[PDB]
């Protein structure tokens, strides 16, 4: 993270599609270095649905500049999450802040 920043790191990190952002709130059912499974809340449940959100993080895939694109989780088991909260950190991102 930048020790001195401007407060716009959060917006740049979230708006760019490099980080995994939870679609619906709930609790993190399963955490792994590759995938995340979230047990959604009953309020956001849809009828006739099991009610889990599955995020498959992209690990070590080349970018257009021959760099490495990597996504790392930043949540733990049982940690409640809300809609719009970062679940994984993309390349050059630390806890939802741009980290170049």
């Amino acid at each position: 993270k930048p020790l001195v920043g401007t407060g716009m790191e959060r917006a740049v990190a979230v708006d760019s599609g490099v980080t995994a952002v939870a679609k619906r709130g709930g609790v993190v059912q399963y955490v792994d270095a590759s995938r995340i499974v979230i047990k959604v809340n009953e309020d956001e449940m849809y009828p006739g649905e099991a009610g889990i959100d599955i995020y498959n993080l992209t690990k070590y895939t080349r970018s257009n500049q021959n760099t490495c694109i990597n996504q790392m989780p930043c949540v733990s088991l049982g940690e409640p999450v809300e809609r719009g909260d970062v679940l994984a950190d993309g390349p050059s991102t630390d806890l939802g802040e741009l980290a170049l």
Partner: protein, 232 residues
């Protein structure tokens, strides 16, 4: 006595913590304090023998850019934490430790099987975080003895076993000393009132005895200066 110098000697070893410590050498004569402190600081920071993790082999992982089903941390991060493990090897130069963990929870440095000739200074150092109940991690760690910083690039100079696939390499920082700072103060010795004492504060990883470190640095300096003493 003009042509006589009072011999400095070790008088105190204040172990503030298992790593932080302060050594005291006295007495010193009007300028030898700075010289000795600088020489010891420059020798301890560069030429302190130690042990560090050299090679890692995980049961299922085959290269450093993959992940294991169950571990919360990436394999590269796992090697990164393994690089920071502090260990003291007594008796030999090569040690093959084995770690075997299963079940939900962190994997600490206390999970490595006891070896008898190997001591762990940081038993609660984390390595990975198993998350699935039916997840097991098995690792084999080859730890060597050496000096300085030897990156993995320079250690593959010669191919003998051709490095079978699935054997990862981690750069080794063999230095067991992380910070050195010397301070020269005035001390009273036989009412001379012109003598100084040197206090060396050492922050290490806990795998080195500060008195042993000071004696080793002095030995290295004397062995180097014997060449000037001879001078062809």
């Amino acid at each position: 006595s003009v042509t006589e110098f009072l011999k400095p000697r070790l008088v105190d070893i204040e172990q503030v913590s298992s790593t932080h410590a302060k050594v005291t050498l006295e007495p010193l004569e009007r300028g030898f304090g700075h010289t000795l402190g600088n020489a010891l600081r420059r020798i301890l920071l560069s030429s302190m023998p130690g042990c560090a993790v050299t090679e890692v082999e995980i049961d299922g992982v085959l290269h450093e850019y993959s992940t294991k089903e169950g571990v919360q941390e990436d394999i590269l991060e796992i090697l990164l934490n393994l690089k920071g493990l502090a260990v003291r090897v007594q008796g030999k130069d090569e040690v093959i430790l084995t770690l075997n963990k299963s079940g939900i929870g962190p994997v600490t440095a206390a999970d490595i099987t006891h070896d008898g000739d190997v001591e762990i200074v940081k038993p609660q150092h984390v390595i990975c975080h198993l998350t699935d109940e039916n997840a097991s991690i098995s690792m084999r760690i080859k730890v060597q003895r050496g000096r300085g910083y030897v990156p993995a690039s320079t250690r593959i100079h010669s191919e003998e076993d051709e490095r079978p696939i699935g054997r990862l390499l981690v750069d080794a920082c063999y230095s067991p000393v992380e910070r050195i700072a010397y301070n020269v103060e005035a001390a009273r010795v036989e009412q001379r009132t012109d003598l100084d004492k040197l206090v060396i504060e050492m922050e290490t990883n806990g795998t080195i005895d500060p008195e042993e470190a000071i004696r080793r640095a002095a030995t290295i300096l004397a062995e180097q200066l014997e060449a000037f003493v001879d001078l062809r």
